[model samples]
Target: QVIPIPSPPAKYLLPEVTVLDYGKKCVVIDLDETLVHSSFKPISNADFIVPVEIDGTIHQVYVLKRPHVDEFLQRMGQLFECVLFTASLAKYADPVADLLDRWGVFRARLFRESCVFHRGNYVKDLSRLGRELSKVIIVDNSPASYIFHPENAVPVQSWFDDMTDTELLDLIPFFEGLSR
Candidate 1:
């Protein structure tokens, strides 16, 4: 999804202002356990099942299509230049990306999957965000790769535990109010 910088007011999420005009607002979401929990069988995992239910159903069943996630991402795809950045290999990510496309959480068909370390860089898979810091937000379950770079990132706990625990929905105002 390619949401414009500084998104508009949302029903749940706050507007992202600071990240609005930083050149290119990008939402680099992590895959695997973050987006889709790969705990169960490969078939279910490939279907976006992560055990944690968003509203009341499993991710594999229709988590992305859930009203909350759908609306949030719909607004995102319209407000920022988003992309998927994963540690999973290209072969594995390609199929997952296909599933996201089918679900509507993904837009722009932008898939820049990279290895945990690419081009001799540590976890370079995510370095793609270095292109623009202030204009980006990396939503991942892991804290190590992003803790030191808080200004340019937002770490949400993995949904494998409690789907409703995603605090980002509460910080929408802070995110959308950037540099207003």
Candidate 2:
């Protein structure tokens, strides 16, 4: 037997901007395995290929936009101060992020250079972010990614191509409530 989860309040889905006393809450989101599934090799069903050039050499990588990513981002824009934080190289993530957020929803994008190398993993330190730790949270798939700031992390299910995944949708209300 399975229990059904009821839809959240209607207001959470409206994409209506709400002003909060604490201003906008900061949300640091991971890229690969979080919002998008990327690969260096060609994927026949990929949304698009992002060409990255480094040291006079060029390589193309496939990027697939997660389902409901646009809607999630659109609503997130109205709810919080969204920041795209990724462990991927800047040369690759920059353009891919631009394609994902053409509307400027994400206020900033931090690539691998912004991460701290520790224990063979690039860890994102939320305390280093200008925002107060209380007003910030990170949503990521890898525990190693947010290892430096577990208290401010919101661990999410790794996204691949599950057409029925609703984690993003389910989190809308929680983020909205946190924003207020």
Candidate 3:
């Protein structure tokens, strides 16, 4: 008979919760195309121009804020333990978040390194967040991102430069009900 070795417990993606967000449900938010749209090409009306260095070369990334994103984030921050989780490299996403989330809405920021690359998609495995599945919700534009836990996701349309989009605004009521 062969004996099997015991494996150690898996480490959680997020750290211990702060007292302020102790009882609130954790809401994981996606960066690109969810809250904002970013591009390598210059946008004439870019909301934020982030400079990111890669391999000793600096590249300017243009970002455009989603309409009603401010109101959506503010309300979500107050209602749930908000977390910024993106599949993009931190070098680009970090600075964009810094300018977008002026109110410190996101409790923790997670980059590409935190995602699980499964079946060619960067999946945000809710089970790895160390929170109860029932209390964890993910808002992402891509279905593949939340394929690991689709039941816990609030799907949003991928936003580009659509000025008339109200997806974020429309979701506020649904989120309000979910928070309770």
- Top candidate when judged by TM-score against the true structure: 3
Residue 90 lDDT (model 3): 95
lDDT of each: 0.50, 0.81, 0.91
Sliding window of 10 residues with minimal summed lDDT for model 3: 1-10
Worst 10 residues of 1 by lDDT: 59-68
Tens digit per residue, CA lDDT, model 2, 47-141: 87888998999888898877878888899988788889888888898999888886878877888877889989988887777677788889899
Let me know the TM-score candidate 3 reaches against the reference structure: 0.92
Sort every candidate by TM-score, greatest first.
3, 2, 1
Q: Compared with the true structure, what per-residue lDDT tens digits does model 1 show for residues 26-86?
A: 6766665555555433442233543444457654332232114444555555556556666
Worst 10-residue lDDT window, candidate 2: 9-18
Which regions in candidate 1 have their CA more than 4 angstroms from the true location?
Answer: 1-23, 42-67, 103-113, 116-130, 161-163, 166-168, 171-174
Backbone clash pairs for candidate 2 read: none
lDDT of 1 at 94: 59
